[PDB]
Amino acid sequence: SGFRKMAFPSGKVEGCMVQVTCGTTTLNGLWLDDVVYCPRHVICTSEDMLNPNYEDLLIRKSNHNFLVQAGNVQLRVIGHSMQNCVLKLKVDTANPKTPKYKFVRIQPGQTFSVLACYNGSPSGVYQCAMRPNFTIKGSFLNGSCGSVGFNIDYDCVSFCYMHHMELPTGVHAGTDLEGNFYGPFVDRQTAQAAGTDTTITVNVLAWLYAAVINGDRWFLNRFTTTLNDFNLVAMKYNYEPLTQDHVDILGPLSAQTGIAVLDMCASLKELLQNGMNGRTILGSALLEDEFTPFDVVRQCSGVTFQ
C-alpha cells in the first residue's frame, strides 16, 4: 500500500539525450536512430528572439555550425532540416541504444514523466499532467530546453513532449515531437499568456478511489447524484464537466471498491461545498488532479515494464 507521485523508469530515455550547440547557444537534443531532434530556437541569437524568421536563419547555416555531443563522443552532422518548430539534424552514426519508440500527441488531463536535462546530461525525473490550458507546471532552469516527456507502454517509449519555454507565470510550454505546439503558443518572445486553468475532474475522482483503496474513507456518504446535477455544481468551482466516457473509464476502480461512480460524485460534491475541515486525504489538504485512472490502477494493482 501507499501512494506516491510515481514517474516511469528513465533508463531507456537517458541513453538518447545529447547536447546540441549552435554558436553560443547550447541545449538538449533527442538522438533516435541517426536523427537528433531539438527546439529550432537553438539557431536564434539575442537580436532574433523578438521576430525570428526561421527559414532565413536556417538557410544561413551549414552542417558544421552544429556541434552535437553524446557525452564525450562527437557526432558529425551530415544534414539538417526543419519540421514545424523542431530541428532535425541527420548524423553519421545511428544511436545503438535507440529503444522501440513512437511519437504520440497527448490530450489535456493525461500524465507523463519528464526527464529534465542540462548540457545533454539527465538531472532528474518527475511526473506531471498536461493542463486543460495546454501548459505544464514543470520544474525547469536555464538550459533545460529540449528535455522530453514520455510514457512507457510495455517495451515501447511513447514520446509526447519537448520543452521549449517558460511563460511569465512560471508555467511551461512545448511541442509534440512533430514540432507542433501544445496550446496557442509560438516560439518567439512576445507577450503570450496561458488562459485560465480548470481542475481535471475525472482525475480527482480517480484519486479519491486511490484514497479508499488505501484506507481513507471519512469523506464517503450514502447519497447519490446524477451526471447533470454534479456537472451543475462542478461548473461553479471551475471543474471540467464529467462525461459518460469518464464514468466508463473509472469502471475498474468502481469494481474494486464497490463504490459506484455517481456515488463517489456525491462525496466530491460535498467536499467542494463544505471543504475538507482540516482533514487530509492521502496526506494532502487539497484535492489532487494530476493522477489519471490509469496511474491509480498501475500503482494500486501493479504493472511493470520491459
Residues of this chain that bind ligand 5Z3 (CB under 6 A)? 41, 44, 49, 52, 140-145, 164-166, 172, 187-189
Question: Which of 191, 215, 277, 303 lies at the binding interface for its own copies (CB under 8 A)?
Answer: 191
In the complex with ligand 5Z3, the residue whose CB is nearer, 167 or 282, is 167
Asked if 305 and 152 count as a contact pair (C-beta separation under 8 A), the reply is: yes
Q: Is 176 in the site for its own copies (CB under 8 A)?
A: yes
Chain CA centroid to CA 54, Å: 26
Q: Is 122 in the site for its own copies (CB under 8 A)?
A: no
3-state class (DSSP) for residue 205? helix
Is 145 marked active-site? yes
The edge-to-edge listing of strands for the beta sheet with 17-22 is 73-75, 66-70, 17-22, 25-32, 35-39, 86-91, 77-83
- DSSP characters over 15-46: TTEEEEEETTEEEEEEEETTEEEEEGGGG--T
Candidates 222, 210, 233, 201; CA nearest to 281 is: 210
Candidates 250, 42, 18, 16; CA nearest to 150 is: 16
Question: Which of 190, 274, 277, 304 lies at the binding interface for its own copies (CB under 8 A)?
Answer: 190
Beta bridge pairs of residue 55? none
Chain CA centroid to CA 186, Å: 18
Q: What is the distance between the alpha carbons of residues 257 and 268, in angstroms, rounded to a whole number? A: 16
Stretch 76-115 residues interacting with its own copies (CB under 8 A): 83-84, 102-105, 107-108
In the complex with ligand 5Z3, the residue whose CB is nearer, 25 or 98, is 25
Is 64 marked active-site? no
Q: Is 245 in the site for its own copies (CB under 8 A)?
A: yes
The entry of ligand 5Z3, its own copies, none that residue 107 binds, CB within 5 to 8 Å by partner kind: its own copies
Candidates 103, 88, 207, 96; CA nearest to 151 is: 103
Stretch 44-83 residues interacting with its own copies (CB under 8 A): 83
Q: Is 306 in the site for its own copies (CB under 8 A)?
A: no
- What amino acid is encoded at 2 in this protein? G
In the complex with ligand 5Z3, the residue whose CB is nearer, 75 or 114, is 114
Residue among 22, 41, 164, 246 flagged as catalytic: 41
CB of 295 to ligand 5Z3, least distance (A): 24
Asked if 71 and 15 count as a contact pair (C-beta separation under 8 A), the reply is: no
The entry of ligand 5Z3, its own copies, none that residue 121 binds, CB within 5 to 8 Å by partner kind: none
The entry of ligand 5Z3, its own copies, none that residue 192 binds, CB within 5 to 8 Å by partner kind: its own copies
The set of catalytic residues is 41, 145
What residue ranges bind its own copies (CB under 8 A)?
83-84, 102-105, 107-108, 176, 178, 180, 184, 186, 190-193, 195, 241, 243-245, 248
